[PDB]
Amino acid sequence: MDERDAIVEIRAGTGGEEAALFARDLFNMYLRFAEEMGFETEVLDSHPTDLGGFSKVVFEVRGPGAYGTFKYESGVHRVQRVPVTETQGRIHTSTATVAVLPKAEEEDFALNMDEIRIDVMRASGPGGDGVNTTDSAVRVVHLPTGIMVTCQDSRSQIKNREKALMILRSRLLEMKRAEEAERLRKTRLAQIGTGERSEKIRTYNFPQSRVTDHRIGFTTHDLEGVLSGHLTPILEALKRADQERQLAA
Amino acid sequence: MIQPQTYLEVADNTGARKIMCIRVLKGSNAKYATVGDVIVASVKEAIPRGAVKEGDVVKAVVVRTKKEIKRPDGSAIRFDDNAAVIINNQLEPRGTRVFGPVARELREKGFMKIVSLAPEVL
RNA sequence: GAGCUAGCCCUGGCCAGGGUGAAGCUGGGGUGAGACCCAGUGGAGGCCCGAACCGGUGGGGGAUGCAAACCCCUCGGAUGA
RNA sequence: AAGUCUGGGCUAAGUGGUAAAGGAUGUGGCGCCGCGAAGACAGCCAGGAGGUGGCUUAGAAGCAGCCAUCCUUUAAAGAG
RNA sequence: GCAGUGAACAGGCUCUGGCGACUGUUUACCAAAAACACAGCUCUCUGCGAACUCGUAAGAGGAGGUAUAGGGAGCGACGCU
RNA sequence: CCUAAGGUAGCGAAAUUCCUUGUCGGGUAAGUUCCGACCUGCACGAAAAGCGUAACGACCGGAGCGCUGUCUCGGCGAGGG
RNA sequence: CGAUCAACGGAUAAAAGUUACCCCGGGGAUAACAGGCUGAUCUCCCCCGAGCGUCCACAGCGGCGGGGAGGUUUGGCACCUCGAUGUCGGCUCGUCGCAUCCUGGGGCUGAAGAAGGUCCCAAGGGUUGGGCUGUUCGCCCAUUAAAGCGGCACGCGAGCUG
RNA sequence: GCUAGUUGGUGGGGUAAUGGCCCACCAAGGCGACGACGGGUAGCCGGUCUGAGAGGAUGGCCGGCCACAGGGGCACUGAG
RNA sequence: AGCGCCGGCCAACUCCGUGCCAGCAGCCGCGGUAAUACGGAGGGCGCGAGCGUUACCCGGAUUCACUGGGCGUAAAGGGC
RNA sequence: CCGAGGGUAGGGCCCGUGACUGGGGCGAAGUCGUAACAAGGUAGCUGUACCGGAAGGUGCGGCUGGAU
RNA sequence: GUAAAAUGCUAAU
RNA sequence: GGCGCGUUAACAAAGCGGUUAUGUAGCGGAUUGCAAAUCCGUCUAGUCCGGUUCGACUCCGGAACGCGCCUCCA
Ligand SMILES: [K+]
Ligand SMILES: [Mg+2]
Ligand SMILES: [Mg+2]
Ligand SMILES: [Mg+2]
Ligand SMILES: [Mg+2]
Ligand SMILES: [Mg+2]
Ligand SMILES: [Mg+2]
Ligand SMILES: [Mg+2]
Ligand SMILES: [Mg+2]
Ligand SMILES: [Mg+2]
Ligand SMILES: [Mg+2]
Ligand SMILES: [Mg+2]
Ligand SMILES: [Mg+2]
Ligand SMILES: [Mg+2]
Ligand SMILES: [Mg+2]
Ligand SMILES: [Mg+2]
Ligand SMILES: [Mg+2]
Ligand SMILES: [Mg+2]
Ligand SMILES: [Mg+2]
Ligand SMILES: [Mg+2]
Ligand SMILES: [Mg+2]
Ligand SMILES: [Mg+2]
Ligand SMILES: [Mg+2]
Ligand SMILES: [Mg+2]
Ligand SMILES: [Mg+2]
Ligand SMILES: [Mg+2]
Ligand SMILES: [Mg+2]
Ligand SMILES: [Mg+2]
Ligand SMILES: [Mg+2]
Ligand SMILES: [Mg+2]
Ligand SMILES: [Mg+2]
Ligand SMILES: [Mg+2]
Ligand SMILES: [Mg+2]
Ligand SMILES: [Mg+2]
Ligand SMILES: [Mg+2]
Ligand SMILES: [Mg+2]
Ligand SMILES: [Mg+2]
Ligand SMILES: [Mg+2]
Ligand SMILES: [Mg+2]
Ligand SMILES: [Mg+2]
Ligand SMILES: [Mg+2]
Ligand SMILES: [Mg+2]
Ligand SMILES: [Mg+2]
Ligand SMILES: [Mg+2]
Ligand SMILES: [Mg+2]
Ligand SMILES: [Mg+2]
Ligand SMILES: [Mg+2]
Ligand SMILES: [Mg+2]
Ligand SMILES: [Mg+2]
Ligand SMILES: [Mg+2]
Ligand SMILES: [Mg+2]
Ligand SMILES: [Mg+2]
Ligand SMILES: [Mg+2]
Ligand SMILES: [Mg+2]
Ligand SMILES: [Mg+2]
Ligand SMILES: [Mg+2]
Ligand SMILES: [Mg+2]
Ligand SMILES: [Mg+2]
Ligand SMILES: [Mg+2]
Ligand SMILES: [Mg+2]
Ligand SMILES: [Mg+2]
Ligand SMILES: [Mg+2]
Ligand SMILES: [Mg+2]
Ligand SMILES: [Mg+2]
Ligand SMILES: [Mg+2]
Ligand SMILES: [Mg+2]
Ligand SMILES: [Mg+2]
Ligand SMILES: [Mg+2]
Ligand SMILES: [Mg+2]
Ligand SMILES: [Mg+2]
Ligand SMILES: [Mg+2]
Ligand SMILES: [Mg+2]
Ligand SMILES: [Mg+2]
Ligand SMILES: [Mg+2]
Ligand SMILES: [Mg+2]
Ligand SMILES: [Mg+2]
Ligand SMILES: [Mg+2]
Ligand SMILES: [Mg+2]
Ligand SMILES: [Mg+2]
Ligand SMILES: [Mg+2]
Ligand SMILES: [Mg+2]
Ligand SMILES: [Mg+2]
Ligand SMILES: [Mg+2]
Ligand SMILES: [Mg+2]
Ligand SMILES: [Mg+2]
Ligand SMILES: [Mg+2]
Ligand SMILES: [Mg+2]
Ligand SMILES: [Mg+2]
Ligand SMILES: [Mg+2]
Ligand SMILES: [Mg+2]
Ligand SMILES: [Mg+2]
Ligand SMILES: [Mg+2]
Ligand SMILES: [Mg+2]
Ligand SMILES: [Mg+2]
Ligand SMILES: [Mg+2]
Ligand SMILES: [Mg+2]
Ligand SMILES: [Mg+2]
Ligand SMILES: [Mg+2]
Ligand SMILES: [Mg+2]
Ligand SMILES: [Mg+2]
Ligand SMILES: [Mg+2]
Ligand SMILES: [Mg+2]
Ligand SMILES: [Mg+2]
Ligand SMILES: [Mg+2]
Ligand SMILES: [Mg+2]
Ligand SMILES: [Mg+2]
Ligand SMILES: [Mg+2]
Ligand SMILES: [Mg+2]
Ligand SMILES: [Mg+2]
Ligand SMILES: [Mg+2]
Ligand SMILES: [Mg+2]
Ligand SMILES: [Mg+2]
Ligand SMILES: [Mg+2]
Ligand SMILES: [Mg+2]
Ligand SMILES: [Mg+2]
Ligand SMILES: [Mg+2]
Ligand SMILES: [Mg+2]
Ligand SMILES: [Mg+2]
Ligand SMILES: [Mg+2]
Ligand SMILES: [Mg+2]
Ligand SMILES: [Mg+2]
Ligand SMILES: [Mg+2]
Ligand SMILES: [Mg+2]
Ligand SMILES: [Mg+2]
Ligand SMILES: [Mg+2]
Ligand SMILES: [Mg+2]
Ligand SMILES: [Mg+2]
Ligand SMILES: [Mg+2]
Ligand SMILES: [Mg+2]
Ligand SMILES: [Mg+2]
Ligand SMILES: [Mg+2]
Ligand SMILES: [Mg+2]
Ligand SMILES: [Mg+2]
Ligand SMILES: [Mg+2]
Ligand SMILES: [Mg+2]
Ligand SMILES: [Mg+2]
Ligand SMILES: [Mg+2]
Ligand SMILES: [Mg+2]
Ligand SMILES: [Mg+2]
Ligand SMILES: [Mg+2]
Ligand SMILES: [Mg+2]
Ligand SMILES: [Mg+2]
Ligand SMILES: [Mg+2]
Ligand SMILES: [Mg+2]
Ligand SMILES: [Mg+2]
Ligand SMILES: [Mg+2]
Ligand SMILES: [Mg+2]
Ligand SMILES: [Mg+2]
Ligand SMILES: [Mg+2]
Ligand SMILES: [Mg+2]
Ligand SMILES: [Mg+2]
Ligand SMILES: [Mg+2]
Ligand SMILES: [Mg+2]
Ligand SMILES: [Mg+2]
Ligand SMILES: [Mg+2]
Ligand SMILES: [Mg+2]
Ligand SMILES: [Mg+2]
Ligand SMILES: [Mg+2]
Ligand SMILES: [Mg+2]
Ligand SMILES: [Mg+2]
Ligand SMILES: [Mg+2]
Ligand SMILES: [Mg+2]
Ligand SMILES: [Mg+2]
Ligand SMILES: [Mg+2]
Ligand SMILES: [Mg+2]
Ligand SMILES: [Mg+2]
Ligand SMILES: [Mg+2]
Ligand SMILES: [Mg+2]
Ligand SMILES: [Mg+2]
Ligand SMILES: [Mg+2]
Ligand SMILES: [Mg+2]
Ligand SMILES: [Mg+2]
Ligand SMILES: [Mg+2]
Ligand SMILES: [Mg+2]
Ligand SMILES: [Mg+2]
Ligand SMILES: [Mg+2]
Ligand SMILES: [Mg+2]
Ligand SMILES: [Mg+2]
Ligand SMILES: [Mg+2]
Ligand SMILES: [Mg+2]
Ligand SMILES: [Mg+2]
Ligand SMILES: [Mg+2]
Ligand SMILES: [Mg+2]
Ligand SMILES: [Mg+2]
Ligand SMILES: [Mg+2]
Ligand SMILES: [Mg+2]
Ligand SMILES: [Mg+2]
Ligand SMILES: [Mg+2]
Ligand SMILES: [Mg+2]
Ligand SMILES: [Mg+2]
Ligand SMILES: [Mg+2]
Ligand SMILES: [Mg+2]
Ligand SMILES: [Mg+2]
Ligand SMILES: [Mg+2]
Ligand SMILES: [Mg+2]
Ligand SMILES: [Mg+2]
Ligand SMILES: [Mg+2]
Ligand SMILES: [Mg+2]
Ligand SMILES: [Mg+2]
Ligand SMILES: [Mg+2]
Ligand SMILES: [Mg+2]
Ligand SMILES: [Mg+2]
Ligand SMILES: [Mg+2]
Ligand SMILES: [Mg+2]
Ligand SMILES: [Mg+2]
Ligand SMILES: [Mg+2]
Ligand SMILES: [Mg+2]
Ligand SMILES: [Mg+2]
Ligand SMILES: [Mg+2]
Ligand SMILES: [Mg+2]
Ligand SMILES: [Mg+2]
Ligand SMILES: [Mg+2]
Ligand SMILES: [Mg+2]
Ligand SMILES: [Mg+2]
Ligand SMILES: [Mg+2]
Ligand SMILES: [Mg+2]
Ligand SMILES: [Mg+2]
Ligand SMILES: [Mg+2]
Ligand SMILES: [Mg+2]
Ligand SMILES: [Mg+2]
Ligand SMILES: [Mg+2]
Ligand SMILES: [Mg+2]
Ligand SMILES: [Mg+2]
Ligand SMILES: [Mg+2]
Ligand SMILES: [Mg+2]
Ligand SMILES: [Mg+2]
Ligand SMILES: [Mg+2]
Ligand SMILES: [Mg+2]
Ligand SMILES: [Mg+2]
Ligand SMILES: [Mg+2]
Ligand SMILES: [Mg+2]
Ligand SMILES: [Mg+2]
Ligand SMILES: [Mg+2]
Ligand SMILES: [Mg+2]
Ligand SMILES: [Mg+2]
Ligand SMILES: [Mg+2]
Ligand SMILES: [Mg+2]
Ligand SMILES: [Mg+2]
Ligand SMILES: [Mg+2]
Ligand SMILES: [Mg+2]
Ligand SMILES: [Mg+2]
Ligand SMILES: [Mg+2]
Ligand SMILES: [Mg+2]
Ligand SMILES: [Mg+2]
Ligand SMILES: [Mg+2]
Ligand SMILES: [Mg+2]
Ligand SMILES: [Mg+2]
Ligand SMILES: [Mg+2]
Ligand SMILES: [Mg+2]
Ligand SMILES: [Mg+2]
Ligand SMILES: [Mg+2]
Ligand SMILES: [Mg+2]
Ligand SMILES: [Mg+2]
Ligand SMILES: [Mg+2]
């Protein structure tokens, strides 16, 4: 949580080429704010538009307290301005989404052989007196989940027991990777949603040099400073309305 | 003499028409069920929208047997079908009516609501 | 050595009984004429059922056999290559 | 077939007559310390306290985890 | 009369997959099948003393046939390919 | 990058799928088989044809009804031994 | 002088496969079954006590290591048997072992009761019927006091099945 | 496309009374694009609502008629 | 004495709040920092023991056209 | 005899539901291309046929609702 | 009759 | 497990005992209203460990991972 490093997933929202450009404005804003926090950044996945923006950027913020600070950015950020892609001079309202994820463990997976039952038995099919009399077939059962793997690929119980455990581990792992991925998915959709013009967490109105965080009501007018990284006023104001939410009973 | 695979008519209004005994609930391995014994059964045939439906695994008490029942007085009684009344795990009937005669052995085995509901006790 | 067996050649013989009912023909309808429809007649077919005859499906028996391939029940073909 | 032979000792497990780490007031024999009528060891009979806790902990306040383990009448009483 | 093809001879049925179109054929004597064959499709050879086959040859088959024919090969009713 | 060129239609856990009793659905009280789907087809695929197909089959699967000494579970009787 | 006659004391100048259509002569000199020896693998039991268990090593557990038992599995070896020791499963008929699934007797419990956990004694008896698959095994259904695990040539084909 | 009491006849049965209403038999007829048969829906009208009217919609109360009396069938009694 | 309404249709408007949010909506459409269109307020309009909404029928719909419509290119001449 | 109904067997119609599958309508942003509207850069459209990620392309015949 | 190198441009009166 | 092949930069992929591979991308410029296309330039390397050699991406041995083939008579 709060003290671990953080992954920030910036994705273009409704807006097309201008959402992607604004996504890069949100991108540069976070990289700078990281510097003014002693935090280290590193880009893991970048999808540039030939216009200069990013349809998606994923980067980590490395340093004690990253998920503590950056966590208040997960949501939909609305831009209202005259796009560089606009030619009739109109104001368009585009969106970009920010997703904040605490950095994960690549925790290694190994089998607790004490929760694994190994059955040996006669195999099936050809073999003559061999297949009739040999306990070459192996079933391995993951007793907690109940899933089993069977192998009679070879004549050897030892080789078949090894291949069975291999496949069993590979299948449990794919289950464990799938749970964490479904958990990641729901978490992500909670923060990002559809990315529609509603759902917004913060507005950046360039005509009015206004930056409004409709979660707490904090408005500033240093839109240039905000976009240059100076986000600390908003965070603290969010941080304080957070603690004022934690006034109980 | 009922056993697994035996078909029984349902002498009540639960919706079930034919049940197939799958177990004789009388100890570890009773071979046979007679009047007043409970069985587990599969509901093989039912009328639409009844309480129980086809596929349900139900309990019932056997009320009539084609194998005659012998009685301490030297008499016997025999029915034209094998019939059972579907009950719950508390031995109470699940329907509200009992169709046809039932064996008086049900009384002495604590199936009094069923005996009551039955139009004749023989 | 083809008196067993396989194929072919020549010349004879055999296939109870029952069932289905093609074409055609006749009549009627239909049309400009037709197609075609209907009924009757008709008797086609590696058509149907089933003996003989030719087989040998499943099971049982037999296993120093009645028999070095049989017996019983059952079963396939039976106008056709 | 030839000693119920002789002398000294050990074993009580039928060990002898089927095995290991390891465990044990089994038994016998050695040592080498130590404490003892400055009355020992065991039992019994008192005292065995206090400022009362010091960090963390609404009590853990002598008798959780942490910190070091000050001192009085004293014959001896650890903030155990 | 319990019972009338009163004895004997005389289909159990249905739903749904695979394979093979079908009737046929086969390992005499452990396999009858999804195997072989089959009409049908295609490729190919062959102008006639044909090609091809048997034979050292002569001579035969092909065929007393002639490319709508004869040999060889694969595929295997039919449908859509 | 490589190849002569990189499997089309149709079909697919299949007479083909190792993992496999794949997964989902159906049927069952309960279905490693069966049927219908799905498609990462270990290792289908177009005359060693591909995919279908009415009818046919002593072919090989799956299910139900009928009926039963197959069975629970055995009993008695007959005749040849 | 001409040899990767390199299978290097070099069969010809000149040589690949397949057989489940197979055959003969041999071998238990040598594999596959079973036995045997062994016991790495397998199964079971201990030692140590790091740590878990709010507290508390030891109710229940046991890091890193250590010592054994058994002779069900998978192997190693190739010792009787290749002038034959018929091999899976099922069926039938059992009998033995006990490391005990149940029932009987117990100690400890983080045992209120009830119900369990764990270990000890105990082999007298008992240990069901189904769906799937040839299956052994395993899963599932419905029950049960319980639905034990092993040996007997993985018991039993001059007993049956196939 | 529908039709076997189906459509007609004759003779009867039944009814207060006509009739295939029912029956035996004779004939092979009867209905249908002017919609038979089947399916859906609906008790019908006086009236009511609306509409410039024509139309449309509708059938609640009130009046008239029909139909039904838990779901079905049946006859007895009776002027009914 | 209350209820509906005051962008246009449609009779009745100004102020603050809000800032494509909250919301309005029968149709055309309102709301993205000077909203007669959202919310309130004041003011106004319409009805009144009612005022609105929802459902449904006729109307407006000559939009099934008999009264009372159409078919070259808008939907619409049958290939002959 | 007829007969409520019950039972047995086979049909018909309708409804709901079904692993999976087919396309369809919709969307203030996505990926691919650019078929049509200007000889829309190959006049277009057309019935049909074959083919291709996709719009489409091409063949045959028709139309002008085709350009200069 | 001949005559075209060349794809694209979201979304706010 | 046996046998064969491989590991190079951003990706794909080569040669080489001494030496900008290459294509595409990326990066600076041009062009364009802008993007693409196009034009001018430009660029990051050899899986680990140990040997041979003056010198190893290149050769030898091992490891690690990946690919391909085989594992039959019971
Ligand atoms: K062989
Ligand atoms: Mg523009
Ligand atoms: Mg184990
Ligand atoms: Mg085996
Ligand atoms: Mg099998
Ligand atoms: Mg073999
Ligand atoms: Mg073995
Ligand atoms: Mg029911
Ligand atoms: Mg059913
Ligand atoms: Mg069902
Ligand atoms: Mg009941
Ligand atoms: Mg009854
Ligand atoms: Mg002859
Ligand atoms: Mg002869
Ligand atoms: Mg003759
Ligand atoms: Mg004949
Ligand atoms: Mg005849
Ligand atoms: Mg005949
Ligand atoms: Mg005849
Ligand atoms: Mg007949
Ligand atoms: Mg005739
Ligand atoms: Mg004639
Ligand atoms: Mg004629
Ligand atoms: Mg005729
Ligand atoms: Mg005939
Ligand atoms: Mg005749
Ligand atoms: Mg015939
Ligand atoms: Mg026949
Ligand atoms: Mg017949
Ligand atoms: Mg024959
Ligand atoms: Mg025979
Ligand atoms: Mg014969
Ligand atoms: Mg038989
Ligand atoms: Mg026999
Ligand atoms: Mg026999
Ligand atoms: Mg014999
Ligand atoms: Mg003999
Ligand atoms: Mg015979
Ligand atoms: Mg005979
Ligand atoms: Mg016979
Ligand atoms: Mg016959
Ligand atoms: Mg016959
Ligand atoms: Mg026959
Ligand atoms: Mg016949
Ligand atoms: Mg005949
Ligand atoms: Mg003939
Ligand atoms: Mg003595
Ligand atoms: Mg002496
Ligand atoms: Mg002892
Ligand atoms: Mg002894
Ligand atoms: Mg001893
Ligand atoms: Mg009589
Ligand atoms: Mg018959
Ligand atoms: Mg069949
Ligand atoms: Mg199929
Ligand atoms: Mg199948
Ligand atoms: Mg055949
Ligand atoms: Mg065949
Ligand atoms: Mg076929
Ligand atoms: Mg066919
Ligand atoms: Mg054929
Ligand atoms: Mg076919
Ligand atoms: Mg025949
Ligand atoms: Mg026949
Ligand atoms: Mg034979
Ligand atoms: Mg033979
Ligand atoms: Mg023979
Ligand atoms: Mg035979
Ligand atoms: Mg065969
Ligand atoms: Mg045979
Ligand atoms: Mg046959
Ligand atoms: Mg054959
Ligand atoms: Mg054929
Ligand atoms: Mg053909
Ligand atoms: Mg031809
Ligand atoms: Mg030819
Ligand atoms: Mg010759
Ligand atoms: Mg010759
Ligand atoms: Mg000649
Ligand atoms: Mg001649
Ligand atoms: Mg020919
Ligand atoms: Mg053939
Ligand atoms: Mg063939
Ligand atoms: Mg074929
Ligand atoms: Mg392939
Ligand atoms: Mg192709
Ligand atoms: Mg094609
Ligand atoms: Mg395909
Ligand atoms: Mg598949
Ligand atoms: Mg399956
Ligand atoms: Mg298939
Ligand atoms: Mg395959
Ligand atoms: Mg499989
Ligand atoms: Mg398999
Ligand atoms: Mg399963
Ligand atoms: Mg199911
Ligand atoms: Mg069913
Ligand atoms: Mg299933
Ligand atoms: Mg089976
Ligand atoms: Mg299937
Ligand atoms: Mg798959
Ligand atoms: Mg094939
Ligand atoms: Mg071929
Ligand atoms: Mg093949
Ligand atoms: Mg081919
Ligand atoms: Mg097929
Ligand atoms: Mg067809
Ligand atoms: Mg077929
Ligand atoms: Mg067929
Ligand atoms: Mg056949
Ligand atoms: Mg045949
Ligand atoms: Mg056959
Ligand atoms: Mg069956
Ligand atoms: Mg059955
Ligand atoms: Mg049956
Ligand atoms: Mg018997
Ligand atoms: Mg007897
Ligand atoms: Mg006798
Ligand atoms: Mg050599
Ligand atoms: Mg040599
Ligand atoms: Mg040599
Ligand atoms: Mg030498
Ligand atoms: Mg030589
Ligand atoms: Mg030479
Ligand atoms: Mg050689
Ligand atoms: Mg040879
Ligand atoms: Mg072979
Ligand atoms: Mg073979
Ligand atoms: Mg032979
Ligand atoms: Mg031979
Ligand atoms: Mg021979
Ligand atoms: Mg031999
Ligand atoms: Mg031999
Ligand atoms: Mg020999
Ligand atoms: Mg040797
Ligand atoms: Mg020897
Ligand atoms: Mg051996
Ligand atoms: Mg070996
Ligand atoms: Mg061996
Ligand atoms: Mg051996
Ligand atoms: Mg061995
Ligand atoms: Mg053995
Ligand atoms: Mg051995
Ligand atoms: Mg032996
Ligand atoms: Mg051992
Ligand atoms: Mg040992
Ligand atoms: Mg060991
Ligand atoms: Mg031990
Ligand atoms: Mg602890
Ligand atoms: Mg404790
Ligand atoms: Mg351990
Ligand atoms: Mg050890
Ligand atoms: Mg040991
Ligand atoms: Mg042993
Ligand atoms: Mg031993
Ligand atoms: Mg052994
Ligand atoms: Mg062994
Ligand atoms: Mg030996
Ligand atoms: Mg030796
Ligand atoms: Mg031997
Ligand atoms: Mg002998
Ligand atoms: Mg001997
Ligand atoms: Mg012998
Ligand atoms: Mg035993
Ligand atoms: Mg014990
Ligand atoms: Mg236990
Ligand atoms: Mg006990
Ligand atoms: Mg006890
Ligand atoms: Mg207790
Ligand atoms: Mg308790
Ligand atoms: Mg206890
Ligand atoms: Mg104990
Ligand atoms: Mg016991
Ligand atoms: Mg079954
Ligand atoms: Mg079974
Ligand atoms: Mg089994
Ligand atoms: Mg198994
Ligand atoms: Mg118990
Ligand atoms: Mg239990
Ligand atoms: Mg069981
Ligand atoms: Mg055995
Ligand atoms: Mg056994
Ligand atoms: Mg045996
Ligand atoms: Mg035998
Ligand atoms: Mg056996
Ligand atoms: Mg024996
Ligand atoms: Mg024997
Ligand atoms: Mg014996
Ligand atoms: Mg013997
Ligand atoms: Mg067999
Ligand atoms: Mg057999
Ligand atoms: Mg009549
Ligand atoms: Mg009538
Ligand atoms: Mg008549
Ligand atoms: Mg009706
Ligand atoms: Mg109705
Ligand atoms: Mg009007
Ligand atoms: Mg009306
Ligand atoms: Mg009524
Ligand atoms: Mg009522
Ligand atoms: Mg009534
Ligand atoms: Mg009534
Ligand atoms: Mg109003
Ligand atoms: Mg106004
Ligand atoms: Mg003012
Ligand atoms: Mg309003
Ligand atoms: Mg309105
Ligand atoms: Mg706004
Ligand atoms: Mg304002
Ligand atoms: Mg404004
Ligand atoms: Mg305002
Ligand atoms: Mg509004
Ligand atoms: Mg309004
Ligand atoms: Mg307002
Ligand atoms: Mg009033
Ligand atoms: Mg209206
Ligand atoms: Mg009108
Ligand atoms: Mg008019
Ligand atoms: Mg008009
Ligand atoms: Mg015209
Ligand atoms: Mg037209
Ligand atoms: Mg037409
Ligand atoms: Mg009736
Ligand atoms: Mg009826
Ligand atoms: Mg439906
Ligand atoms: Mg275009
Ligand atoms: Mg075009
Ligand atoms: Mg253009
Ligand atoms: Mg173009
Ligand atoms: Mg064009
Ligand atoms: Mg065209
Ligand atoms: Mg083309
Ligand atoms: Mg038009
Ligand atoms: Mg041009
Ligand atoms: Mg130009
Ligand atoms: Mg272009
Ligand atoms: Mg694009
Ligand atoms: Mg576009
Ligand atoms: Mg390996
Ligand atoms: Mg390289
Ligand atoms: Mg690379
Ligand atoms: Mg290259
Ligand atoms: Mg090279
Ligand atoms: Mg380069
Ligand atoms: Mg470049
Ligand atoms: Mg550039
Ligand atoms: Mg390197
Ligand atoms: Mg070096
Ligand atoms: Mg080096
Ligand atoms: Mg270098
Ligand atoms: Mg290297
Ligand atoms: Mg190397
Ligand atoms: Mg293998
Ligand atoms: Mg071999």
Short mmCIF file of N, CA, C and O (backbone and C1' of nucleotides) in Angstrom, two decimals, chain D residues 52-63:
data_model
loop_
_atom_site.label_atom_id
_atom_site.label_comp_id
_atom_site.label_asym_id
_atom_site.label_seq_id
_atom_site.Cartn_x
_atom_site.Cartn_y
_atom_site.Cartn_z
P U D 52 5.41 3.06 46.21
"O5'" U D 52 5.69 1.62 45.59
"C5'" U D 52 4.68 0.61 45.64
"C4'" U D 52 4.70 -0.32 44.45
"C3'" U D 52 5.05 -1.77 44.78
"O3'" U D 52 4.29 -2.64 43.94
"C1'" U D 52 6.56 -0.95 43.17
P G D 53 2.79 0.46 38.79
"O5'" G D 53 3.16 -0.54 37.60
"C5'" G D 53 4.40 -0.46 36.92
"C4'" G D 53 5.57 -0.38 37.87
"C3'" G D 53 6.85 0.23 37.33
"O3'" G D 53 6.80 1.65 37.27
"C1'" G D 53 7.37 -1.72 38.55
P G D 54 7.09 2.43 35.89
"O5'" G D 54 8.59 2.96 36.05
"C5'" G D 54 9.21 3.76 35.06
"C4'" G D 54 10.59 3.26 34.73
"C3'" G D 54 10.83 2.89 33.27
"O3'" G D 54 11.15 4.00 32.46
"C1'" G D 54 11.55 1.12 34.64
P C D 55 10.04 4.64 31.48
"O5'" C D 55 10.52 4.20 30.02
"C5'" C D 55 9.63 4.24 28.91
"C4'" C D 55 9.96 3.17 27.90
"C3'" C D 55 8.83 2.72 26.99
"O3'" C D 55 8.64 3.58 25.87
"C1'" C D 55 9.95 0.82 27.87
P U D 56 7.17 4.08 25.45
"O5'" U D 56 6.37 2.75 25.08
"C5'" U D 56 6.45 2.17 23.77
"C4'" U D 56 6.06 0.70 23.78
"C3'" U D 56 4.57 0.40 23.86
"O3'" U D 56 3.93 0.45 22.59
"C1'" U D 56 5.74 -0.93 25.44
P U D 57 2.32 0.55 22.45
"O5'" U D 57 1.80 0.52 23.96
"C5'" U D 57 0.42 0.32 24.26
"C4'" U D 57 0.24 -0.81 25.25
"C3'" U D 57 -0.83 -0.62 26.33
"O3'" U D 57 -2.16 -0.85 25.89
"C1'" U D 57 1.15 -1.36 27.34
P A D 58 -3.18 0.39 25.73
"O5'" A D 58 -3.67 0.73 27.21
"C5'" A D 58 -4.04 2.07 27.54
"C4'" A D 58 -4.88 2.19 28.79
"C3'" A D 58 -4.47 1.37 30.00
"O3'" A D 58 -3.31 1.84 30.67
"C1'" A D 58 -6.83 1.35 29.78
P G D 59 -2.08 0.84 31.01
"O5'" G D 59 -2.51 0.14 32.38
"C5'" G D 59 -3.55 -0.82 32.40
"C4'" G D 59 -3.59 -1.61 33.67
"C3'" G D 59 -2.38 -2.52 33.93
"O3'" G D 59 -1.30 -1.84 34.56
"C1'" G D 59 -4.35 -3.79 34.12
P A D 60 0.19 -1.89 33.93
"O5'" A D 60 0.63 -3.41 34.06
"C5'" A D 60 1.79 -3.88 33.39
"C4'" A D 60 1.76 -5.38 33.25
"C3'" A D 60 2.90 -5.99 32.43
"O3'" A D 60 4.10 -6.22 33.17
"C1'" A D 60 0.85 -6.77 31.60
P A D 61 5.18 -5.04 33.37
"O5'" A D 61 4.65 -4.27 34.67
"C5'" A D 61 4.09 -4.99 35.76
"C4'" A D 61 3.57 -4.06 36.83
"C3'" A D 61 3.27 -4.68 38.17
"O3'" A D 61 4.43 -4.99 38.91
"C1'" A D 61 1.57 -3.15 37.62
P G D 62 4.39 -6.17 40.00
"O5'" G D 62 5.91 -6.21 40.48
"C5'" G D 62 6.98 -6.19 39.54
"C4'" G D 62 7.88 -7.38 39.75
"C3'" G D 62 7.33 -8.69 39.17
"O3'" G D 62 7.84 -8.92 37.86
"C1'" G D 62 7.82 -8.96 41.49
P C D 63 6.86 -9.08 36.59
"O5'" C D 63 6.31 -10.57 36.71
"C5'" C D 63 7.13 -11.70 36.41
"C4'" C D 63 6.37 -12.98 36.64
"C3'" C D 63 4.92 -12.95 36.16
"O3'" C D 63 4.78 -13.29 34.78
"C1'" C D 63 4.99 -13.69 38.41
#
